[PDB]
């Protein structure tokens, strides 16, 4: 965010603030491509659920299989601009960058040694009457594993 | 190769050599385990999986 | 809490174990993570049924009955100070909880009961804080609450709220000839078998086989015996003339 | 009998992690504080009349004082609020004394909790005022507490003569 | 053992985009302002007692002053509100001083945020007042700030003689 400053003139320069839960999509930060983009929070990469198949019997049920479900990650952002024409170009650039046809590598900042596989799936409806928008988009990971660094033995 | 499911010999597919009763995709490694071969020199690539 | 004076306190205080703690597969989750605490556990009190019926002119006719399974909900609290160690905490917790078969679950407020179940699913976890409250669900396909094991040599000397099925009955053959286990109006007979002295005949009920000297010899059992209807009650006597009996039940 | 004055009830604070270094301190210039307890009563109507089912206890706590110059404990409370640490609270009554095994002790009550409010409104014609609210875990415990000599008396002057002080 | 007067708390402002051109200035004719903090606590009831969980910080800020004649800073605040620009805020206390490394500085606090209210009600028999409200980003930071010589003293008049001024 910001740090304490005196009441005098400040002659130095301050650079952009990188949030904690930034995302590397295909090796590029979205904060670098667009100057108004900011990632707020990432939810859905913490806990995992299973699926159990069973049939009813007289004194309960019999379990005959298990499966591991996929994962969906929802990322909330904020896009800000002053001109009405340029925000459409910003959205065009963002959509052209996010759209992919195969899996890619996904890196998060708060986990420096974890690797994800996923792709862009869908986006939420955005507001059409303002120049500051808060919304989210969904990433569909078909492999619910978190990998680590490669070791040779 | 385990991800694809084939055995390569000098860049050629020779999967037919395996026995019908050998374990191919059931080969799982654990900590402090030893893998040995009497004919060649081994190199193993693996990644730690956390669910 | 415990009352303390306004003077300096020179002793050391330890962590607080809540009233309803859970041993999952023989381990306590409070001893693995330093920011974990169990709040409350729900759904282990009553059970429901499922009655099948067909509609008729003046009501309905009941033909079958079943017992529903059980689902247990556990609520916890995970707390930490850094944005990076909480991920390792979650990874540890999932490494411990995920299992492939059934396990044994113990609760602190019920020190004489045993449970069977496994982890099924979890609720969504908030992603904008370091103090998190959520829950997960355990799926129990066996809705019975068992107890300690009792071994009795032919006479039941305990109190049972419901008739139960013994797990197995080991015998040691003394006399030579056939075998017949007799109970009130119920019996299990092997009338075509010749047993020498010292054979170990084990009647296993959970699988449905009769083991003789560690071999499957179910072929000796008559077809008119009560092999599935054999249930014992309090103050009941099981006697056999050709061997000495041992009974395992809960 | 005799009425009981409200000026005989005071409060003491101490941050939990410093319980092995210091004794509890008294915040200066206290004006009033409020302590309340309540239960939620759920009523079910039957053919005989209402039947009440009671719930757990909820605590409502607040405090008020005047900020003094050079007092460092307000900084401690502010830091505890910022970092979200546990705080201990003692409610001591000076009108009750112990008899047999507690001769120099007063009746008191013990609490622990967090800090959930910190406000101050400075105007152009009054003195600075501070208001604090707490959120309390568990159930408060009862016992007897110790008050030091300097925290239980008020200072005043005595007779003086009419000569130069040497 | 002295109370702290409410007059010794003042506020300073500055627009963020002019951080390299001018120093922070002081609003004229300040009357009062409100500064509050709070956390929202969620109570979970167990068999041993309630367990409280804490949330993030919420800031409530406001200020009130009297409009002066020929002041150009009110126009700056109005333009900042119209164009939705960031503003810096200082809350300096005049009764606290530093000893070792902060010799001529006062204890203060630093915030950044927008403007979300701008009201004035001119009647026919009173002076004109202004009320402002703020929305604060992030968490406030603590430090020591510098006050210049003309922002900390009040003008008076000095004794004169009865002879014609030359």
CSV table of N, CA, C and O in Angstrom, one decimal, chain B residues 1-50:
chain,number,residue,atom,x,y,z
B,1,UNK,N,8.6,-44.3,-20.5
B,1,UNK,CA,7.7,-43.1,-20.3
B,1,UNK,C,6.4,-43.5,-19.6
B,1,UNK,O,5.8,-44.4,-20.1
B,2,UNK,N,6.0,-42.8,-18.6
B,2,UNK,CA,4.9,-43.1,-17.8
B,2,UNK,C,3.6,-42.3,-18.1
B,2,UNK,O,2.5,-42.8,-18.1
B,3,UNK,N,3.8,-41.0,-18.5
B,3,UNK,CA,2.7,-40.2,-18.8
B,3,UNK,C,2.0,-40.6,-20.1
B,3,UNK,O,0.8,-40.6,-20.2
B,4,UNK,N,2.7,-41.0,-21.1
B,4,UNK,CA,2.2,-41.4,-22.4
B,4,UNK,C,1.8,-42.9,-22.4
B,4,UNK,O,0.7,-43.2,-22.9
B,5,UNK,N,2.6,-43.7,-21.8
B,5,UNK,CA,2.4,-45.2,-21.8
B,5,UNK,C,3.1,-46.0,-22.8
B,5,UNK,O,2.6,-47.0,-23.2
B,6,UNK,N,4.3,-45.6,-23.2
B,6,UNK,CA,5.1,-46.3,-24.2
B,6,UNK,C,6.5,-46.5,-23.7
B,6,UNK,O,7.0,-45.7,-22.8
B,7,UNK,N,7.2,-47.5,-24.2
B,7,UNK,CA,8.6,-47.7,-23.9
B,7,UNK,C,9.4,-47.5,-25.2
B,7,UNK,O,9.1,-48.1,-26.2
B,8,UNK,N,10.4,-46.6,-25.1
B,8,UNK,CA,11.2,-46.2,-26.3
B,8,UNK,C,12.5,-46.8,-26.2
B,8,UNK,O,13.2,-46.8,-25.1
B,9,UNK,N,13.0,-47.3,-27.3
B,9,UNK,CA,14.3,-47.9,-27.4
B,9,UNK,C,15.0,-47.2,-28.7
B,9,UNK,O,14.6,-47.5,-29.8
B,10,UNK,N,16.0,-46.4,-28.4
B,10,UNK,CA,16.7,-45.6,-29.5
B,10,UNK,C,15.7,-44.9,-30.4
B,10,UNK,O,15.7,-45.0,-31.6
B,11,UNK,N,14.8,-44.1,-29.7
B,11,UNK,CA,13.8,-43.3,-30.3
B,11,UNK,C,12.8,-44.1,-31.2
B,11,UNK,O,12.1,-43.6,-32.1
B,12,UNK,N,12.6,-45.4,-30.9
B,12,UNK,CA,11.6,-46.2,-31.5
B,12,UNK,C,10.7,-46.9,-30.5
B,12,UNK,O,11.1,-47.2,-29.4
B,13,UNK,N,9.4,-47.1,-30.9
B,13,UNK,CA,8.4,-47.6,-30.0
B,13,UNK,C,8.6,-49.2,-30.0
B,13,UNK,O,8.4,-49.8,-31.0
B,14,UNK,N,8.9,-49.7,-28.8
B,14,UNK,CA,9.1,-51.2,-28.7
B,14,UNK,C,8.3,-51.6,-27.4
B,14,UNK,O,8.9,-52.4,-26.6
B,15,UNK,N,7.1,-51.2,-27.2
B,15,UNK,CA,6.3,-51.5,-26.1
B,15,UNK,C,6.0,-53.0,-26.0
B,15,UNK,O,5.7,-53.5,-24.9
B,16,UNK,N,6.1,-53.7,-27.1
B,16,UNK,CA,5.7,-55.1,-27.2
B,16,UNK,C,6.6,-56.0,-26.3
B,16,UNK,O,6.2,-57.2,-26.1
B,17,UNK,N,7.7,-55.6,-25.9
B,17,UNK,CA,8.6,-56.4,-25.1
B,17,UNK,C,8.2,-56.7,-23.7
B,17,UNK,O,8.6,-57.7,-23.2
B,18,UNK,N,7.3,-55.9,-23.1
B,18,UNK,CA,6.9,-56.1,-21.8
B,18,UNK,C,6.1,-57.4,-21.6
B,18,UNK,O,5.4,-57.8,-22.5
B,19,UNK,N,6.3,-58.0,-20.4
B,19,UNK,CA,5.5,-59.2,-20.0
B,19,UNK,C,4.1,-58.8,-19.8
B,19,UNK,O,3.8,-57.7,-19.4
B,20,UNK,N,3.2,-59.8,-20.0
B,20,UNK,CA,1.8,-59.5,-19.7
B,20,UNK,C,1.4,-59.4,-18.3
B,20,UNK,O,0.4,-58.8,-18.0
B,21,UNK,N,2.3,-59.8,-17.4
B,21,UNK,CA,2.0,-59.7,-15.9
B,21,UNK,C,3.0,-58.8,-15.2
B,21,UNK,O,3.3,-59.1,-14.0
B,22,UNK,N,3.5,-57.8,-15.8
B,22,UNK,CA,4.4,-56.8,-15.2
B,22,UNK,C,3.6,-55.6,-14.8
B,22,UNK,O,2.5,-55.3,-15.4
B,23,UNK,N,4.1,-54.8,-13.8
B,23,UNK,CA,3.4,-53.6,-13.3
B,23,UNK,C,4.0,-52.4,-14.0
B,23,UNK,O,5.2,-52.2,-13.9
B,24,UNK,N,3.2,-51.6,-14.7
B,24,UNK,CA,3.7,-50.5,-15.4
B,24,UNK,C,3.2,-49.2,-14.8
B,24,UNK,O,4.0,-48.3,-14.5
B,25,UNK,N,1.9,-49.0,-14.7
B,25,UNK,CA,1.3,-47.8,-14.1
B,25,UNK,C,1.1,-47.9,-12.6
B,25,UNK,O,0.6,-46.9,-12.0
B,26,UNK,N,1.3,-49.1,-12.0
B,26,UNK,CA,1.2,-49.3,-10.6
B,26,UNK,C,2.6,-49.0,-9.8
B,26,UNK,O,2.6,-49.2,-8.6
B,27,UNK,N,3.6,-48.6,-10.6
B,27,UNK,CA,4.9,-48.3,-10.0
B,27,UNK,C,4.9,-47.0,-9.3
B,27,UNK,O,4.9,-45.9,-9.9
B,28,UNK,N,4.8,-47.0,-8.0
B,28,UNK,CA,4.8,-45.8,-7.2
B,28,UNK,C,6.0,-45.8,-6.2
B,28,UNK,O,6.3,-46.8,-5.6
B,29,UNK,N,6.6,-44.6,-6.1
B,29,UNK,CA,7.8,-44.5,-5.2
B,29,UNK,C,7.4,-43.8,-3.9
B,29,UNK,O,6.4,-43.0,-3.9
B,30,UNK,N,8.1,-44.1,-2.9
B,30,UNK,CA,7.9,-43.5,-1.6
B,30,UNK,C,9.3,-43.1,-1.0
B,30,UNK,O,10.4,-43.4,-1.5
B,31,UNK,N,9.3,-42.3,0.1
B,31,UNK,CA,10.5,-41.9,0.7
B,31,UNK,C,11.4,-43.0,1.2
B,31,UNK,O,10.9,-44.0,1.7
B,32,UNK,N,12.7,-42.8,1.1
B,32,UNK,CA,13.7,-43.8,1.6
B,32,UNK,C,13.6,-45.2,0.9
B,32,UNK,O,14.1,-46.1,1.4
B,33,UNK,N,13.0,-45.2,-0.3
B,33,UNK,CA,12.9,-46.5,-1.0
B,33,UNK,C,14.1,-46.5,-2.0
B,33,UNK,O,14.7,-45.5,-2.4
B,34,UNK,N,14.5,-47.8,-2.4
B,34,UNK,CA,15.6,-48.0,-3.2
B,34,UNK,C,15.2,-48.7,-4.5
B,34,UNK,O,14.4,-49.6,-4.5
B,35,UNK,N,15.6,-48.2,-5.7
B,35,UNK,CA,15.4,-48.8,-7.0
B,35,UNK,C,16.7,-49.2,-7.6
B,35,UNK,O,17.6,-48.3,-7.7
B,36,UNK,N,16.8,-50.4,-8.0
B,36,UNK,CA,18.0,-51.0,-8.5
B,36,UNK,C,17.8,-51.7,-9.9
B,36,UNK,O,16.7,-52.2,-10.1
B,37,UNK,N,18.8,-51.6,-10.7
B,37,UNK,CA,18.8,-52.4,-12.0
B,37,UNK,C,20.2,-52.9,-12.2
B,37,UNK,O,21.2,-52.3,-12.0
B,38,UNK,N,20.2,-54.2,-12.7
B,38,UNK,CA,21.5,-54.9,-12.8
B,38,UNK,C,22.1,-54.7,-14.2
B,38,UNK,O,23.2,-55.2,-14.4
B,39,UNK,N,21.5,-54.1,-15.1
B,39,UNK,CA,22.0,-54.0,-16.5
B,39,UNK,C,22.3,-52.6,-16.9
B,39,UNK,O,23.1,-52.4,-17.8
B,40,UNK,N,21.7,-51.5,-16.3
B,40,UNK,CA,21.9,-50.2,-16.8
B,40,UNK,C,22.1,-49.2,-15.6
B,40,UNK,O,22.2,-49.7,-14.5
B,41,UNK,N,22.2,-48.0,-15.9
B,41,UNK,CA,22.3,-46.9,-15.0
B,41,UNK,C,21.1,-46.0,-15.0
B,41,UNK,O,20.6,-45.6,-16.0
B,42,UNK,N,20.5,-45.8,-13.8
B,42,UNK,CA,19.1,-45.2,-13.7
B,42,UNK,C,19.2,-43.7,-13.4
B,42,UNK,O,20.1,-43.2,-12.8
B,43,UNK,N,18.2,-43.0,-14.0
B,43,UNK,CA,17.9,-41.7,-13.7
B,43,UNK,C,16.4,-41.5,-13.6
B,43,UNK,O,15.7,-41.9,-14.5
B,44,UNK,N,16.0,-40.9,-12.5
B,44,UNK,CA,14.5,-40.8,-12.2
B,44,UNK,C,14.1,-39.4,-12.1
B,44,UNK,O,14.8,-38.6,-11.4
B,45,UNK,N,13.0,-39.0,-12.8
B,45,UNK,CA,12.5,-37.7,-12.7
B,45,UNK,C,11.1,-37.8,-12.0
B,45,UNK,O,10.3,-38.6,-12.5
B,46,UNK,N,10.9,-37.0,-11.0
B,46,UNK,CA,9.6,-37.0,-10.3
B,46,UNK,C,9.3,-35.7,-9.7
B,46,UNK,O,10.2,-34.8,-9.5
B,47,UNK,N,8.0,-35.4,-9.4
B,47,UNK,CA,7.5,-34.2,-8.7
B,47,UNK,C,6.7,-34.6,-7.5
B,47,UNK,O,6.0,-35.6,-7.6
B,48,UNK,N,6.9,-33.8,-6.5
B,48,UNK,CA,6.1,-34.1,-5.3
B,48,UNK,C,4.6,-33.6,-5.5
B,48,UNK,O,4.4,-32.5,-5.9
B,49,UNK,N,3.7,-34.5,-5.1
B,49,UNK,CA,2.3,-34.3,-5.4
B,49,UNK,C,1.6,-34.0,-4.0
B,49,UNK,O,1.7,-34.8,-3.1
B,50,UNK,N,1.0,-32.8,-3.9
B,50,UNK,CA,0.3,-32.4,-2.7
B,50,UNK,C,-1.2,-32.2,-3.1
B,50,UNK,O,-1.5,-31.3,-3.9
